[PDB]
């Protein structure tokens, strides 16, 4: 289904070798950063105002990624 | 005591108002980001290879910032 979100988020997967490269093609994404804490994690921070939309949904991203394990999760703060 | 770290980290305070400003001041700091989840939280990402260091310790950051409630805390990842 179609995926959307105004909030930054994370990419968690066992194969992150194409994450950065794939995310560059989305003009709504501002930057991307691998976690110092866990290799299977990447933070995706969005351009202001932008709304990340992915028509083909998560499977579409998995497909672009070349990783079926990939998962999109919210960012976590130790205060909530 | 001196404060040092090579890893990204969070800033957490009640008066977030000069955080971004103060952070730009450090050439070891690459970017800063307020959390969508919590108004008191800012992410601090460091330039690659860089070491963020505060000789006056965290207290020196509380000074610069004007926020005695400021705390530096590690980043948390899902598991």
UniProtKB/TrEMBL annotation, chain B:
Pfam families: VP9
Limits of the White spot syndrome virus (WSSV) Orf116/126 N-terminal domain: 3-76
InterPro entries, A to Z: VP9_N_sf, WSSV_Orf116/126_N
Protein name per its UniProtKB record: ICP11/P9
């Amino acid at each position: 289904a179609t995926f959307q979100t105004d909030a930054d988020f994370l990419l968690v997967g066992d194969d992150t070798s194409r994450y950065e490269e794939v995310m560059k093609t989305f003009d709504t994404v501002e930057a991307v950063r691998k976690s110092d804490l866990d290799d299977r994690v990447y933070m995706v921070c969005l351009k202001q105002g932008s709304t990340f939309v992915l028509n083909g949904g998560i499977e579409e991203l998995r497909l672009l990624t070349g990783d079926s394990t990939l998962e999109i999760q919210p960012m976590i703060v130790p205060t909530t």
